[PDB]
Amino acid sequence: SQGMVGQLAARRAAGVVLEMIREGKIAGRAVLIAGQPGTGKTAIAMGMAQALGPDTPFTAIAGSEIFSLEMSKTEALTQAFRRSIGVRIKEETEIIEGEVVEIQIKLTLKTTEMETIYDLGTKMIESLTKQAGDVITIDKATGKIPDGELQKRKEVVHTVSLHEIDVINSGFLALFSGDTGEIKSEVREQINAKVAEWREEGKAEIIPGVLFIDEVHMLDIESFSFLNRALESDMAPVLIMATNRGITRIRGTSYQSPHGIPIDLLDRLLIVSTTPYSEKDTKQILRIRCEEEDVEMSEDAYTVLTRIGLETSLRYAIQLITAASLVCRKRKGTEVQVDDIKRVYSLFLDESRSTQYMKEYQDAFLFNELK
Amino acid sequence: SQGMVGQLAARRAAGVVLEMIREGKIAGRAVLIAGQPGTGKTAIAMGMAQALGPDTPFTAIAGSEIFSLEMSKTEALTQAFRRSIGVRIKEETEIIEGEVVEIQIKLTLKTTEMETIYDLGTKMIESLTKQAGDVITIDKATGKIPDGELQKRKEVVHTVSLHEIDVINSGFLALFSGDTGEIKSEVREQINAKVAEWREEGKAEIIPGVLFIDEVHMLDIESFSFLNRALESDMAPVLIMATNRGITRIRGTSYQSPHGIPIDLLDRLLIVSTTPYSEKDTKQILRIRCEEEDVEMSEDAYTVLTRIGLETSLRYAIQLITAASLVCRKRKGTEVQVDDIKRVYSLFLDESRSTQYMKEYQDAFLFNELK
Ligand SMILES: [Mg+2]
Ligand SMILES: [Mg+2]
Ligand SMILES: [Mg+2]
Ligand SMILES: [Mg+2]
Ligand SMILES: [Mg+2]
Ligand SMILES: [Mg+2]
């Protein structure tokens, strides 16, 4: 584990894809992550974005989320793609770094090569109040920590997605306003042009990110045509789809097809697969979520919760970590124990027990009926 | 029973959820109450709102109620969410409290520290007509019941839902007017802005309440996308859904799914379940509804009506309380008896007997046919 747990084979395949992307040998190609749910597909796609760069746009959606009352399928996909396409701007900031020589209430700084007196404002004096070398950024303040020049320059790369720029140009309770969440079509075409001229001027760079679409089988034929068209664009992001369906109907038609994907799009897919998490992987993941939530848990508790993860889902086992720690705090305990796990397991149902919620009452009802 | 009866396990689970809400560990999470109908699900959700505060907005809808001739699905949900989001305003009222020293027809009040003469209007004199210490609110009147100052200040917190404000800004027979029941989209965005500036000024506070959606399986995929988006908002209420369906189709698609809910939304659900009411719980509830309706009922009558509640539904047994008391009043009786229960049970059908209404006539018809 160097960022995530398990899924060694899938990660290995993902690595080969990353080398295709860097070598440019993935033009007009997308990825499909087959496998059952809860096998770390999102982690795979997310880690691929990071592998391309520290600030690579990553967007994760679900197939069902393009059918909404707030947007059209076209608008939903457009936003999904514009969140995954980054614009990289270089900010050039001036930074005065030097050794403090004197303060007068004028600031005299020096490097090993020069010395200068800088006028001091009221905000600077106070800021300064809160003979050793430091840093000062212009139109800003101090950062107490030099040779060469006193005023040097530091670069600050900024990465912003096309969608982020859409919002800046075009929010509180906006969801509950009743009006759609569309972006004006004439605003995007203004931003598409502003970003086009900046790129021609060399002031901006386009960084195609990673768009992850889970439950891709929920898309209909119209939406797949959109995706297929996007893979032919030169600025498109790395498309990654996922589904646990084998063969199924193509929504919008009466035709079966592998994963419910039309052939024109299947033809350009690199298919990978994830397997279910082993007993070791499951406990490893559980341990990592406990540290993140600052939850101390007994070893007998890890064993039980791990078993629950294998018998139900890793998503469900993680829910119980938050619940068990509260049950632990109520009894003034210091670490989650097996009893805490048993209680929350009885209080909160997993998807399988929830779909058969009476079977537990029928058993009890019959068990008492025999008395 | 400290507010409601039975459902100890479900209430226990609900309590653990309340601690998550208060600790903030429920971001992007909703609740699903599985179980059969008539098991106090609404009471659970309602009690959770009260547990958050005395004036926490609570809204209860049914899945089928978003499909109407008066609103669109978007409008129906928007109102449902805006009824569940509260705006808390602090009114600062001046209250003169002091000991009456003299009346002149001028009112002289005093505390243990000061004394003052207040001019008296005609309304005040009359109001006063209807040497001991009392209270007076300015621009109002008297409340006959002190040290410190004479004019003190009392705070009156006011809680109003976003929807209540929508109506104030935007009624008799409005339902039968033929025109839709929409709120102008430009009016909400004006109220969203007025509430936004008040909050920035510290004059208003947003109180996310509790939205309860029963029969959630009636929602279609478009509506579930809306809910999933709302759980990502920071001002959203605590969403609570319910259904007695196990696995069923996702309306708008041809795919089965647990409770007819898409996975993107299932993934973020804490599932609880309610069991059927026991014989003891059922009689307890019946006793409480009698006191509320001011109905005296014999113990042999409670036993019979309780049995009816177990064999049909608690909703139906409660209907018979109103009917039986009228049958009781007709015969000039003082308390409902078994006979009163037997009569109304024969006069008013439960859902099961109503769906087989001829079987009672066929039995009688055949019974006479044999004579
Ligand atoms: Mg594995
Ligand atoms: Mg369709
Ligand atoms: Mg599960
Ligand atoms: Mg019970
Ligand atoms: Mg429909
Ligand atoms: Mg009934």
Numbering used by the authors:
A (entry chain A), B (entry chain A): 43 to 147, 160 to 184, 188 to 202, 228 to 252, 256 to 456
Verbatim from the authors:
The crystal structure of the full-length human transcription regulation factor RuvB-Like 2 (hsRuvBL2) in its apo form was determined to 2.89 Å resolution. The structure shows a hexameric arrangement of monomers similar to other structures in the RuvB-Like family. In the ring-shaped hsRuvBL2 hexamer, each protomer comprises the typical Rossman-like αβα fold (domain I) and the canonical all-α subdomain (domain III), which form the ATPase core together with the internal region of domain II. Moreover, there is an outward-facing mobile unit composing the external region of domain II, linked to the ATPase core by two β-sheet linkers. This unit is absent in all previous crystal structures of human RuvBL2 and is observed here for the first time. The interfaces between protomers form a complete nucleotide binding pocket, which includes the canonical nucleotide-binding motifs in domains I and III: Walker A (G77-T84), Walker B (D299-H302), sensor 1 (M326-N329), sensor 2 (T397-A402) and a trans-arginine finger (R353) from the adjacent protomer. Despite the fact that all purification steps were performed in the presence of ADP, no electron density corresponding to this nucleotide (or segments thereof), could be observed in the pocket. In addition to the overall mobility of domain II, there are four additional loops that are probably too mobile to produce an electron density: D148 - G159, D185 - V187, S203 - C227 and R253 - Q255. Thus, our apo hsRuvBL2 structure provides a missing link that supports the mechanism proposal whereby the N-terminal loop provides an interface between the external region of domain II and the ATPase core.
RuvB-Like (RuvBL) proteins are found in the domains Archaea and Eukarya, including humans and fungi, where they exert roles in transcription regulation, DNA damage repair, cell cycle control, stress adaptation and disease. The RuvB-Like family includes two homologous members, RuvBL1 and RuvBL2. As constituents of chromatin remodeling machines, RuvBL1 and RuvBL2 are involved in epigenetic regulation of transcription through the deposition of H2A.Z in nucleosomes flanking nucleosome-depleted regions around promoters (SWR1), by remodeling nucleosomes in order to increase DNA accessibility for the transcription and repair machinery, by enabling progression of stalled replication forks (INO80) and by the acetylation of histones H2A and H4, increasing chromatin accessibility (TIP60). The RuvBL1/2 complex functions as chaperone itself during the biogenesis of Telomerase, H/ACA RNPs and other supramolecular complexes.
